[PDB]
């Protein structure tokens, strides 16, 4: 049994590597989600994952894809590591030393607690990351940031130390929904697949059920993610509150606009989870001895 420090360090390193690997998918999702915040020409410049990526690299440069990387790295160091270490610790505490088999409720509760703790501490990195990813020189509001640390300085000096935590409640809602949906859907799918013996009770069935659960969770959490992206990237004094933004989005475009960039978000979720899990397990096994 590895100690707490080893688990935390391995989790941090794995999270950082996974975030470094698959950032352009997040950039494409952010670009697609803020496409129609304000009225513009009838011509849509972004359409398709590969199309959006190639347009971004061809027009705004190759380094625009990886804008705001230090903010993501700081978020992974400060938020993800604590989440995926204290999740295991709290889960063991709830189980009370392998007294009983881990029930669904215990895992759900531990995940919700660790997700809330992770979201509350480590919000400014998310805010700055969204601000940097959504900005563009050619169209939209004038770019006001010149990097990541400059964004911190500008927000601290102009807005203060309480405007950095904007939009924490959408993040909490997104985390709770994604966690609960993932767990419930995976459990139900695996149970049904095993009961009807359509597939063998081996790792292929588990992997297929996990992928289905991840897709369902991404599909359910996409609207709240859209609202969060549109609210966080907004000049002060424009949006009154989150419900106002939701009503404006519904009236201006319609319900279909609530599902934007679903494919890039799902791809990022799957890739990040797989890479993080593999690297974390391998590094923990290597460092335990």
């Amino acid at each position: 049994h590895p100690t707490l420090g080893v688990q935390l360090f391995s989790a941090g390193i794995a999270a950082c590597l996974a975030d470094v690997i698959t950032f352009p998918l997040d950039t494409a999702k952010v670009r697609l989600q803020v496409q129609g915040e304000c009225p513009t020409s009838s011509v849509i410049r972004y359409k398709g994952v590969l199309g959006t990526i190639t347009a971004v690299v061809k027009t705004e440069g190759r380094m625009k894809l990886y804008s705001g990387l230090p903010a993501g790295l700081q978020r992974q160091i400060s938020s993800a590591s604590l989440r995926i270490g204290l999740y295991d610790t709290v889960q063991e505490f709830l189980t009370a030393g392998k007294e009983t088999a881990p029930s669904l409720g215990s895992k759900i509760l531990a995940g919700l607690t660790t997700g809330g703790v992770a979201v509350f501490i480590g919000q400014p990195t998310e805010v700055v990351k969204v601000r940097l990813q959504a900005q563009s020189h050619l169209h939209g509001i004038k770019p006001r940031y010149t990097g990541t640390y400059n964004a911190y300085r500008i927000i601290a000096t102009t807005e203060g130390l309480t405007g950095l935590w904007k939009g924490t409640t959408p993040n909490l809602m997104r985390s709770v929904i994604i966690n609960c949906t993932e767990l419930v859907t995976y459990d139900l799918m695996k149970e049904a697949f095993v009961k009807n013996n359509i597939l063998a009770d081996d790792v292929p069935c588990h992997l297929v059920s996990a992928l289905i659960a991840g897709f369902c969770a991404t599909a359910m959490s996409s609207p709240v993610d859209v609202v969060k992206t549109r609210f966080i990237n907004s000049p002060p004094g424009q949006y009154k509150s989150v419900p106002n933004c939701a009503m404006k989005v519904f009236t201006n475009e319609g319900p279909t606009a609530f599902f934007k960039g679903l494919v890039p978000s799902f791809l990022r979720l799957g890739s990040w989870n797989v890479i993080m899990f593999v690297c974390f397990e391998q590094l923990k096994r290597e460092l335990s001895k």
Partner: nanobody
Amino acid sequence: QVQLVESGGGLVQAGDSLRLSCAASGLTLKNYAMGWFRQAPGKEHEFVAVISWSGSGTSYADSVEGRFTISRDNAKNTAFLQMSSLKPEDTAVYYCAARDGGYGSRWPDEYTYWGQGTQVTVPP
């Protein structure tokens, strides 16, 4: 001694075509981004067109979409604008601007050099 010179302007009737050429001397155009800005009397600068460093991706304004065609030549370090299907609202003075950062495109006051400009009129 960075110099930009514009040529091709004059008087053209409605429904015609024009060739605007911007020539740069004193700098290497390999790592610069070219753009064109028009100004009407009694108004501020407006965006017209912009081209990337290697002619890969070009961008146009909303009001000149499909009518104006921008191009460049690094061997002869010049930029060219084809104006077609002119309208009476195009009477203005045009400036050629170069962005140092490379692969760039933005609003005015973000560039580094400017040109003299040429007058284009559509008489009634």
